[PDB]
Structure 1
Amino acid sequence: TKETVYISSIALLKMLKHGRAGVPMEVMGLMLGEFVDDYTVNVVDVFAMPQSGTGVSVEAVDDVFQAKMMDMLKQTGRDQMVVGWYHSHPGFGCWLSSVDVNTQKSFEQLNSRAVAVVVDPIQSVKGKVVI
């Protein structure tokens, strides 16, 4: 089925900038916001995760660096928890790989409402972002 996922105007500009790190190198970063029941995913703020040579794998996530940055974001006015993360798949369509399934499954015990977003900055040059 379908639902409505709201994304703030500031979050779209940051995801397109994060995907500019490189075309062959896939990028991944966290997000912030709230939810309304199960039918609404609100994307307010996004986080930029550091790069990893494993190509966005389950072992490429650092919880130590995550806990240190989210504690500093509380002083900046962010009261919202992590709503998910975005993963760029440049050059291809919108689909999930075998690595993304095992990676997203590891976060099911942490936050079951997490969202895995697939953004394609290469095909977004037409004026409408394919995501």
Structure 2
Amino acid sequence: KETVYISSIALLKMLKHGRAGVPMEVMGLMLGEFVDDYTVNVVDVFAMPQSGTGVSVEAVDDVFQAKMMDMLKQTGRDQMVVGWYHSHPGFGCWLSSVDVNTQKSFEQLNSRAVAVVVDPIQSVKGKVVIDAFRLIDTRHYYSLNIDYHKTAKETKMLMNLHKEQW
């Protein structure tokens, strides 16, 4: 109330993508399900290509998106777009004027859409800089709590990274 649950691959993909795009902003779509009114589940994400005109509605390439969505469907991933993520490399997590316009477009498609913002430069070991937003219902925005969903199998798989530590 309200909470966005972000899965393991989703977080890692957002960090990986944000870091790779530095010093430019990057953007992509979040997949999952609206569980109830107070709960969004992000199970996966995919990157959108860089476009000249920055991170805006114009960078949402709906051909690429439709193609990706279709190919994901063929391999067992048929989750709804539940929002979008983008990076603010070095300048923290919030929504600019343009970001609010983009979020509004996602809101018109689906009133439950969530905007996730990550800072790949200020994200360091022991501190992930990230936040989730919706627009106030009729233009200000508010933060949602972010939690991480993680199965027992995922936890065990993660434990292989620095094994001699567990």
TM-score, normalised with respect to structure 2? 0.73
- Name the SS for the 2:20 alignment partner: coil
- Name the SS for the 2:44 alignment partner: coil
1:105 Cα deviation from its structure 2 partner: 1.3
Q: Structure 2, unaligned stretches of length 5 or more?
A: 130-166
Q: Is this contact kept in 2: 1:58–1:99, CA < 8 A?
A: no
1:45 Cα deviation from its structure 2 partner: 0.7
Is 2:13 aligned against 1:4?
A: no
How far, CA to CA, are the matches of 1:22 and 1:65 in structure 2?
18
How far, CA to CA, are the matches of 1:128 and 1:42 in structure 2?
22
Give the structure with the higher percent strand.
2
How far, CA to CA, are the matches of 1:59 and 1:68 in structure 2?
17
How far, CA to CA, are the matches of 2:59 and 2:4 in structure 1?
27
How far, CA to CA, are the matches of 1:116 and 1:123 in structure 2?
19
1:56 Cα deviation from its structure 2 partner: 0.4
Give the length in aligned residue pairs.
Answer: 129
1:118 Cα deviation from its structure 2 partner: 0.6
Write the deviation string for residues 46-103 of structure 1: whole angstroms up to 9, x where unpaired: 1111111111022121112211110110011112110111011111122110111111
Greater gyration radius: 2
TM-score, normalised with respect to structure 1? 0.91
Q: Structure 1, unaligned stretches of length 5 or more?
A: none
RMSD between superposed Cα atoms in Å: 1.3
